[PDB]
Design a protein around this ligand. Structure first.
Ligand SMILES: O=c1ccn([C@@H]2O[C@H](COP(=O)(O)O)[C@@H](O)[C@H]2O)c(=O)[nH]1
Ligand SMILES: O=c1ccn([C@@H]2O[C@H](COP(=O)(O)O)[C@@H](O)[C@H]2O)c(=O)[nH]1
Lengths: 314, 311
């Protein structure tokens, strides 16, 4: 229907802006495999009872077999992702998945990535692919096809330092007359992100302000928000004094904020600075704090309740 | 094994700085399949006669089949890349392959990319993966493993706008005590690349300059060049005023320059601005002008001879 409408519907459904990050590393997979075998696959057996696992399109036969040795890594990697989604999805307004974690093993991880997006799409849960794509317009069309046609993602992240015009070939497809949403990197959770995003300037404005400004110019040029799509901003949770300014200077803009949890922020200051009455425009991404926690559903609910309490106090 | 030594060794062997870009699109694959079907698989049959094709590690049971299905697209895509490598590798100092062209179909294209790097690695031809990676240090280690451990690439491209420190987790691996090379995006061939790389500045030095300096400071901090690795710059062929500034201000730097051919540059002016006696420090990337040309070897030789004349 459009990412804007889809986000706004689900926010009424579950009343949160929590964005769960699903970034499984190699140690998450082996710990999951060892724990399932020592506990008689209690989580995997629960996955196979879930409805939508019968609708994934890649190696469905292998995935539904009860515990083909070369497929062992594919099996537990994919089932670990189902486990996290099954355990925590009721608290998630959005799921964000970083492309880097699904490529380091070659094609096998892309098949897992495809199944994860198929799974979330049948749950009708909004998705974000954190791929931070950037290239010339001819080349970036390949990224658009992978993100929005193959995976059927709702959105992705973009690094427009090479030029804002790349958004014309990411957020718009003239041949299908289709519109897509994206989050451009504005201020990032790197400790040394300032050297370029702060200390560079044009007309006594810091680079992140000018980059956010240029991003919205492209958004209006492509008429995304008339098609219920948008171009948003990635603003790190630790950047409290740029967050305010983004919300103040650009009201009604969508912000994706990572850095709470594994990178050690303060949730109240982040959410209040980026707050908006439509709080789907202030997505709080929490990944490793949930996915590496021993009781993931318990962890998701903890951050779910904390976010709602800070919303009420707004 | 070091990238600096590998580049300079091969440069003496074939005496060129041509970088052949292998960016096959959807129509390159369909056209290759169509012509192979019309002409009794003459190029695919030539690919299977090569000794080194046995060195690919993914689905060799399909790749080495006589030409004959769900595996049909994978087969012709993979063989098209081998076809180009077989036709043109004698003129290439390095091969650069842009990750974007290998992902849009899902995992199948990554299998081709792996086999392509396997093929080039056994031919001992230097490789570049044009992926322009950028992320936090924890995340980018995954790119380093995919690029330098899985594909065994010699180098890749990086966008350090998120912070120079990501190079610490790309060009160096503390657990293995291994060093890798990279090319940082400095000035790009976008028509509107100026909006950020030119008009942004610190104390009236343009953003690309401060990014280039910050890139080499990181290279010196990691002691890359004593481990026969380096950090280089991506400087567009059309940017003659910055190409010359980089060559003078950073005299011994490695430069990777794309944009000649399909993006309508002038080879003489680009190469002269960035020239260095060790001309492996000025790689000229040519992609579509060769891969989309009807006679790829003839086009590669055309640019090879043209580059050699400019010296
Ligand atoms: O400025 C940014 C942009 C994106 N991410 C991504 O967000 C996720 C953070 O998850 P975690 O730190 O909660 O585990 C990772 O995928 C990371 O690459 C950041 O951490 N900071
Ligand atoms: O500033 C840049 C940086 C990288 N590339 C890459 O170089 C190749 C262009 O070669 P060609 O096919 O245009 O000849 C593509 O992979 C493209 O993504 C550019 O064209 N311009």
């Amino acid at each position: 229907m459009g990412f804007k409408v889809k986000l706004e519907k689900r926010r009424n459904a579950i009343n949160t802006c929590l964005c769960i990050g699903l970034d499984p590393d190699e140690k998450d997979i082996e710990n999951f495999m060892k724990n399932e075998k020592e506990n008689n696959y209690n989580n995997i057996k629960k996955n196979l009872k879930e409805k939508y696992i019968n609708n994934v399109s890649i190696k469905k036969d292998i995935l539904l077999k009860a515990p083909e040795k070369s497929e062992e890594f594919f099996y537990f990697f994919n089932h670990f992702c189902f486990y996290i989604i099954n355990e925590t999805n009721k608290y998630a307004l959005t799921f964000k998945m970083n492309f880097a974690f699904y490529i380091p093993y070659g094609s096998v991880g892309i098949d897992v990535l495809k199944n994860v997006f198929d799974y979330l799409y049948e749950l009708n849960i909004p998705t974000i692919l954190d791929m931070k794509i950037n290239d010339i317009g001819n080349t970036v069309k390949n990224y658009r096809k992978f993100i929005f046609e193959y995976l059927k993602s709702d959105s992705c992240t973009v690094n427009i330092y090479m030029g804002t015009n790349m958004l014309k070939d990411i957020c718009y497809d003239e041949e299908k007359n289709k519109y897509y949403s994206a989050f451009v990197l504005v201020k990032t959770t790197n400790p040394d992100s300032a050297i370029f995003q702060k200390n560079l300037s044009l007309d006594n404005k810091q680079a992140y302000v000018i980059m956010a400004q240029e991003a919205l110019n492209m958004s209006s040029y492509l008429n995304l928000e008339q098609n219920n799509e948008f171009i948003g901003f990635v603003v790190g949770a630790n950047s409290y004094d740029e967050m305010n300014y983004i919300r103040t200077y650009f009201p009604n803009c969508y912000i994706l904020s990572p850095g709470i949890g594994a990178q050690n922020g303060d949730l109240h200051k982040t959410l209040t600075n980026g707050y908006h009455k439509s709080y789907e425009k202030i997505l709080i991404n929490i990944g490793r704090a949930i996915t590496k926690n021993p009781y993931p559903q318990k962890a998701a609910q903890m951050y779910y309740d904390q976010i709602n309490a800070i919303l009420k106090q707004n």
